[PDB]
Amino acid sequence: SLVVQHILRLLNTNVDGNIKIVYALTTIKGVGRRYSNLVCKKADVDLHKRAGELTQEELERIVQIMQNPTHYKIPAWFLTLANNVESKLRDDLERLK
Amino acid sequence: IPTHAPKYEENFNPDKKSYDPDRTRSEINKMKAQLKKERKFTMKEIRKDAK
Amino acid sequence: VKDHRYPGLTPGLAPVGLSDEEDS
Amino acid sequence: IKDMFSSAMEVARFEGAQIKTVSGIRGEIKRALSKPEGHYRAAFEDKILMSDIVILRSW
Amino acid sequence: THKIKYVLLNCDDHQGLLKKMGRDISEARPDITHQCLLTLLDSPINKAGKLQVYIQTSRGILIEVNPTVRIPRTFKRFSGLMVQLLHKLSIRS
Amino acid sequence: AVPSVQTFGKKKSATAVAHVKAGKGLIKVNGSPITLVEPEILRFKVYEPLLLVGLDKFSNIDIRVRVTGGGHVSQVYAIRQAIAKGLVAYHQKYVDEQSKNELKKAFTSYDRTLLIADSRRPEPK
Amino acid sequence: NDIIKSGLAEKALKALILQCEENPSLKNDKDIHIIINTGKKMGINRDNIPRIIPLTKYKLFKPRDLNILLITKDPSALYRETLTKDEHTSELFKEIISVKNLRRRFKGSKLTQLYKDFDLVVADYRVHHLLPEVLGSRFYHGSKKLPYMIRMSKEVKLKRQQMVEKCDPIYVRAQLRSICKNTSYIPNNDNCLSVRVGYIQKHSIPEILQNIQDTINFLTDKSKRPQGGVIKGGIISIFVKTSNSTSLPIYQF
Amino acid sequence: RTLRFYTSKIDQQENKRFKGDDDIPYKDYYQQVQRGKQDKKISR
RNA sequence: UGACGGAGCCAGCGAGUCUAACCUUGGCCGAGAGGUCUUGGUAAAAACUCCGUCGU
């Protein structure tokens, strides 16, 4: 009878727990699908996990990766005239007349 | 039910052009229209004179 | 290393050394 | 054609004008092109080459 | 609507003008339409989300009134909104 | 010489040339088996002759179809028309005329376009 | 090593770096180039194939620093799959594209966008000669983004035999590391030559001077032919400049 | 943290929209080289 | 009745020794005219079918 086994804040961004970790972190500005995938791989967090399931240490590691990319060797690539014109047109108009 | 208020401009004049948040944006948009009108008129006049 | 089809290969092919192969 | 005029306004003044090439192929200034300024369309009695130079005679 | 600025034609405010358009001033009353919308939208049934209102203008214009709207209570502000609605063809929150 | 016949099917710009000869039941379109014809959704369309008269008749012949021009649908219709016409012509030339009549009757009963070209020539009004 | 010892080289680099800071028009200039006046015509027709000059002492760049575009033979399924899976090359390339897809997807103004996004372009040697038609003029004048030839695998071609198609990720990564760290040059049938030697705000003046001497030694050494030893008959003069700054002399014969 | 923080939220929640008859809201070496290059051109 | 990527695959017109950019940084040669190289910026079959991902 005894068996013992929604929202998170990362980089000042709210991420839904129901979304997968990679596509949940994509919502963060400056984080793409490929970049989120690489960060998850570096963090050794299984990509199949939902954002809610993540443990505290895994979130801390992800924050460390994201804030400090170069230390973990993340690739770098991831990281008035109109008045003159109108006056000229007016002058041309006067010259025409 | 949630209750929202309608957004409308008092003394609305559809012929009058829409109010713009940025004065510089309106002023340049005011003037690009003037340049286009003047350019089209003079081009019509020079063509007719040439003909 | 030469390829008859593309004579351009033998000039301007990146030199490879032991340091390059070794992982960072 | 290009380099004959500086702006489309000038071309409109010369629209319909008679022009020719060095080879002697006669043509006409049909219309001024919107982009870039000064470029214009012309029609010639026969196909011209890129090496040819078009001339407008004026006094 | 008609320009004098554009004003919602009213039976009392604009009598001489409506005479010029030739329409009889007996049937120039948008306040009645204002009156019904107030009691309909403020009725508890609307607060229960079981009521939506449509308006068929005499000219033949059909207007959809979202249940969420909060029309102005004063008639003057009500008139200012309709001239916006007929010309812009929509009103946003 | 090996007995052989040639026929054409046409649909808009698509033209198919079918060569039908004595053989062992080898149907190919553009050098590949008929089962690989695309689009798959219309594949049974090009199967329609083979099924309507039965695969037994084809067991003694080889058919080679080459298709050029037009789009997918018109190419499919050209292929089926060419196959039907080729089978009928081969049975005419190198088999009894009774079977020719049965083949023509079956094809015309199912879909006359298998034999006669479907040409939507303009008609002013 | 006389060039490094000569003080003329140091002062010019100090003047060049300083005036780039001062002059707004040179604000976008980041690379340092040396202009070499060979005494005699080289006699080599410009093949647009970069020639790598090994810089022993210092490394100009690492692969992780630059946007790298890889252009592969059609089909790219084997190369894309193998490179993207292998850990060494999983994150090495910004984009992997085939010749046919590159021609179809990118045309006209899109070619300009491709030019800006990528810092380095590399391509299979088999498809290199096709790129000038595809990439357009912008890539192939100036030599800033000129594609580099790389070999996917160590397999070789033998006449009357078919090459086995394989992708060796460690070999590709090794080549790219060499390309980035080592500078490159393109022969032309005229005296003038331009070679990148340094990057402003990354390389100190002593490092750039060493790179120049490495460039001079490799280009003058007859033993390094055909890649090196192209500068026959000595060097009349050498200058230094950025893309938009003028030639400041550092050596004159 | 403290209980009192929860009490404030609980009281705030009860207190926590137009209602009734409310109306809508109203309203130098480099310079030397450059000169030297030019001086050659004019001299020629 | 989406976006991204990959794969497969189907036309008919059309062939004048004629088809085609701009603005810069500098080396060398040349009496000049100009020639060559170097350099940065700007401008410039599809539908269809199958597969994989996200998700309204």
Side-chain angles (χ1 to χ4, degrees):
Chain A
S1 64
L2 193 153
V3 301
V4 291
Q5 311 114 329
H6 293 220
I7 205 168
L8 295 173
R9 191 76 175 177
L10 275 182
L11 193 67
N12 306 285
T13 307
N14 288 320
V15 298
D16 187 356
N18 290 319
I19 301 165
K20 293 284 175 188
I21 181 63
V22 189
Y23 303 101
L25 294 189
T26 46
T27 62
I28 303 180
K29 60 211 194 74
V31 174
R33 304 172 188 77
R34 196 164 195 253
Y35 181 76
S36 55
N37 169 75
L38 172 66
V39 168
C40 286
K41 287 164 148 185
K42 295 319 194 76
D44 294 331
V45 297
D46 181 52
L47 281 74
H48 300 64
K49 305 171 64 175
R50 304 282 193 161
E53 172 198 5
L54 277 295
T55 58
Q56 190 199 359
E57 63 275 18
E58 289 170 357
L59 299 180
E60 293 293 327
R61 290 206 300 276
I62 290 163
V63 168
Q64 289 302 306
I65 298 288
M66 171 166 53
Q67 288 179 357
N68 187 15
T70 64
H71 184 67
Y72 296 93
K73 299 180 287 294
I74 300 293
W77 61 85
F78 280 170
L79 314 189
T80 300
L81 171 51
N83 314 337
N84 303 330
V85 173
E86 174 187 10
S87 179
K88 175 191 56 42
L89 193 155
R90 195 172 91 81
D91 272 297
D92 299 330
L93 188 150
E94 305 321 324
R95 293 307 326 159
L96 184 68
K97 310 319 177 183
Chain B
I1 296 86
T3 303
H4 309 313
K7 178 268 293 192
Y8 67 100
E9 327 182 322
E10 192 58 15
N11 295 320
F12 167 82
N13 180 2
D15 289 329
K16 186 63 66 67
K17 314 313 304 306
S18 159
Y19 183 76
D20 198 298
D22 178 282
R23 302 277 58 69
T24 293
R25 178 180 170 229
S26 63
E27 175 58 279
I28 64 192
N29 286 122
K30 261 290 188 188
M31 187 211 187
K32 290 186 286 186
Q34 291 178 336
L35 167 56
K36 184 179 70 62
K37 188 266 168 166
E38 294 293 328
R39 186 178 293 278
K40 281 193 55 149
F41 175 81
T42 303
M43 282 278 266
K44 185 174 175 65
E45 293 293 328
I46 63 186
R47 291 171 195 273
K48 213 185 295 286
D49 292 319
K51 289 197 208 73
Chain C
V1 295
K2 185 189 72 133
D3 190 312
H4 61 297
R5 299 152 325 165
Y6 314 91
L9 187 154
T10 317
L13 183 65
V16 185
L18 277 294
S19 51
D20 312 316
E21 294 292 329
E22 287 148 16
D23 287 90
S24 66
Chain D
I1 297 89
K2 75 164 158 55
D3 287 354
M4 202 178 248
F5 301 122
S6 68
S7 68
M9 295 212 85
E10 282 184 349
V11 178
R13 276 188 76 130
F14 289 75
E15 267 194 69
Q18 196 176 124
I19 54 173
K20 68 180 180 187
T21 56
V22 176
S23 299
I25 306 174
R26 285 162 295 192
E28 183 197 315
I29 298 178
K30 295 296 188 170
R31 288 268 307 189
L33 293 192
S34 72
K35 309 165 299 278
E37 288 288 322
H39 296 71
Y40 74 85
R41 182 180 92 243
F44 288 85
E45 62 183 2
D46 194 32
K47 181 174 182 176
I48 55 155
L49 297 178
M50 284 286 309
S51 54
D52 280 2
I53 297 160
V54 299
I55 297 89
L56 186 150
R57 171 171 87 164
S58 175
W59 302 97
Chain E
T1 187
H2 163 76
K3 60 208 296 165
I4 61 170
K5 46 200 68 170
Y6 294 69
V7 190
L8 190 69
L9 295 186
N10 194 337
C11 62
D12 291 331
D13 294 331
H14 318 89
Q15 287 144 301
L17 285 86
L18 183 63
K19 198 274 179 187
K20 297 330 184 55
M21 283 74 74
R23 295 179 180 90
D24 52 336
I25 53 169
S26 172
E27 65 183 1
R29 312 182 51 180
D31 65 351
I32 296 180
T33 80
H34 187 226
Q35 194 60 18
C36 290
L37 269 180
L38 269 299
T39 187
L40 282 169
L41 291 191
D42 291 2
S43 182
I45 188 171
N46 185 34
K47 268 50 182 171
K50 280 286 181 178
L51 185 148
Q52 59 177 10
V53 179
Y54 295 75
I55 293 162
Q56 287 176 333
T57 316
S58 304
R59 304 299 315 287
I61 305 170
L62 181 60
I63 302 175
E64 196 284 330
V65 180
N66 194 231
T68 291
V69 74
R70 186 61 143 159
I71 58 176
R73 301 296 203 129
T74 63
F75 167 65
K76 181 39 178 73
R77 299 181 74 188
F78 160 80
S79 69
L81 193 152
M82 311 285 127
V83 304
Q84 178 83 354
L85 169 54
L86 267 51
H87 290 294
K88 302 303 301 183
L89 279 295
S90 54
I91 297 289
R92 294 177 187 275
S93 172
Chain F
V2 177
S4 58
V5 299
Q6 180 183 5
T7 63
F8 300 151
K10 293 181 179 182
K11 178 65 172 179
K12 297 183 175 178
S13 296
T15 305
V17 184
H19 287 113
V20 185
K21 65 180 73 174
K24 55 185 175 319
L26 211 55
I27 306 101
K28 296 176 152 27
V29 180
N30 273 336
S32 86
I34 196 154
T35 60
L36 310 189
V37 165
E38 294 293 328
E40 201 206 350
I41 186 55
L42 297 187
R43 193 170 294 149
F44 262 101
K45 182 66 71 173
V46 66
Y47 285 150
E48 280 185 350
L50 300 176
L51 304 185
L52 268 296
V53 300
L55 300 176
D56 51 37
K57 304 193 173 53
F58 298 86
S59 77
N60 265 348
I61 52 168
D62 291 331
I63 304 184
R64 305 192 212 306
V65 185
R66 313 201 90 66
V67 176
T68 56
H72 293 96
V73 184
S74 65
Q75 274 200 344
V76 163
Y77 280 92
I79 296 155
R80 66 195 295 268
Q81 187 185 15
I83 290 168
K85 289 167 76 79
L87 185 72
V88 174
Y90 182 82
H91 272 245
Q92 157 191 289
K93 216 173 152 54
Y94 303 112
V95 193
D96 63 358
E97 321 276 340
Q98 175 62 32
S99 64
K100 178 190 78 72
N101 299 338
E102 319 201 333
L103 269 67
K104 273 184 100 164
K105 189 142 75 64
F107 289 140
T108 304
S109 175
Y110 186 68
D111 185 6
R112 199 163 171 263
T113 299
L114 280 166
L115 300 167
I116 199 71
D118 185 348
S119 181
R120 309 207 174 196
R121 296 294 86 193
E123 190 277 331
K125 298 211 215 170
Chain G
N1 306 333
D2 56 1
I3 305 304
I4 298 164
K5 306 168 193 327
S6 75
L8 172 52
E10 193 191 338
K11 61 179 74 175
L13 268 63
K14 288 191 60 51
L16 186 62
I17 292 162
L18 178 70
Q19 293 254 120
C20 290
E21 295 174 356
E22 296 176 347
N23 194 332
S25 69
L26 304 182
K27 188 169 155 193
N28 288 316
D29 272 30
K30 301 187 187 189
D31 277 311
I32 306 300
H33 317 270
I34 56 171
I35 311 312
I36 298 93
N37 178 6
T38 73
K40 187 161 192 102
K41 299 309 185 66
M42 302 159 184
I44 298 106
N45 222 316
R46 185 181 172 90
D47 56 354
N48 274 279
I49 295 156
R51 300 291 179 90
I52 305 193
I53 294 165
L55 305 191
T56 68
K57 201 49 161 282
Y58 307 102
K59 310 175 223 172
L60 270 167
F61 292 96
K62 298 291 180 68
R64 315 162 285 151
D65 291 331
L66 282 71
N67 274 317
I68 307 181
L69 174 63
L70 178 59
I71 303 163
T72 75
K73 186 192 162 216
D74 289 275
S76 85
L78 176 146
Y79 311 109
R80 194 196 332 93
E81 180 174 358
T82 308
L83 294 162
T84 313
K85 291 177 39 56
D86 181 73
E87 188 283 318
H88 310 145
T89 50
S90 55
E91 289 295 350
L92 185 58
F93 308 89
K94 163 65 194 214
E95 210 74 1
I96 284 160
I97 191 165
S98 82
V99 175
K100 184 172 73 67
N101 288 319
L102 176 68
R103 183 178 176 181
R104 191 172 41 61
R105 301 164 69 215
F106 304 80
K107 315 165 302 189
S109 67
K110 311 311 190 65
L111 297 177
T112 62
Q113 179 57 278
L114 194 79
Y115 181 92
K116 295 173 178 180
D117 296 346
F118 291 103
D119 306 303
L120 182 69
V121 181
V122 300
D124 192 316
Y125 67 100
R126 295 173 249 157
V127 300
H128 190 271
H129 65 313
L130 305 164
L131 300 195
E133 154 181 53
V134 186
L135 282 178
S137 85
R138 182 67 171 290
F139 283 85
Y140 269 90
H141 68 87
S143 82
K144 171 159 192 258
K145 309 270 174 74
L146 187 63
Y148 284 83
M149 276 202 319
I150 62 169
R151 196 176 65 180
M152 298 300 188
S153 71
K154 297 173 64 38
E155 276 278 10
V156 295
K157 183 65 170 47
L158 272 292
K159 293 184 288 295
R160 301 291 293 263
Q161 215 180 338
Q162 190 167 38
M163 174 186 313
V164 174
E165 290 180 354
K166 177 152 54 59
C167 181
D168 187 3
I170 54 163
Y171 188 40
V172 179
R173 199 201 47 192
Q175 287 168 97
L176 293 161
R177 292 164 144 179
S178 160
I179 289 163
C180 307
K181 69 166 148 201
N182 305 304
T183 196
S184 71
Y185 87 98
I186 300 94
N188 81 93
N189 65 6
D190 202 338
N191 47 68
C192 183
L193 202 60
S194 170
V195 179
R196 292 176 62 185
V197 290
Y199 183 85
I200 199 168
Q201 293 170 29
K202 172 170 183 155
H203 294 88
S204 67
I205 297 174
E207 298 183 323
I208 297 161
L209 288 170
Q210 182 48 249
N211 288 352
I212 294 164
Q213 188 60 42
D214 289 352
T215 299
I216 293 164
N217 289 353
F218 182 76
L219 290 171
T220 56
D221 186 5
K222 296 177 184 168
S223 79
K224 304 301 180 188
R225 63 172 32 97
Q227 309 93 12
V230 68
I231 309 288
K232 320 170 213 294
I235 291 171
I236 309 311
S237 64
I238 307 177
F239 303 83
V240 67
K241 57 187 306 311
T242 66
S243 293
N244 300 303
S245 75
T246 187
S247 66
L248 293 177
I250 63 173
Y251 168 80
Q252 43 84 50
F253 182 76
Chain H
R1 175 64 51 85
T2 180
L3 269 74
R4 204 201 281 141
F5 182 76
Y6 291 96
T7 73
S8 85
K9 291 176 71 68
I10 290 152
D11 305 342
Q12 286 167 43
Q13 184 67 221
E14 299 322 279
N15 313 133
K16 195 213 173 213
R17 182 65 61 83
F18 303 86
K19 47 178 58 188
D21 204 313
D22 300 351
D23 69 330
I24 56 169
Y26 210 81
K27 164 55 212 83
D28 50 59
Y29 170 48
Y30 189 9
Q31 317 187 37
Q32 196 271 359
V33 173
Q34 298 173 242
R35 265 209 301 171
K37 204 152 301 293
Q38 290 146 24
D39 273 9
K40 176 37 150 43
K41 294 264 191 104
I42 297 89
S43 85
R44 180 134 197 166

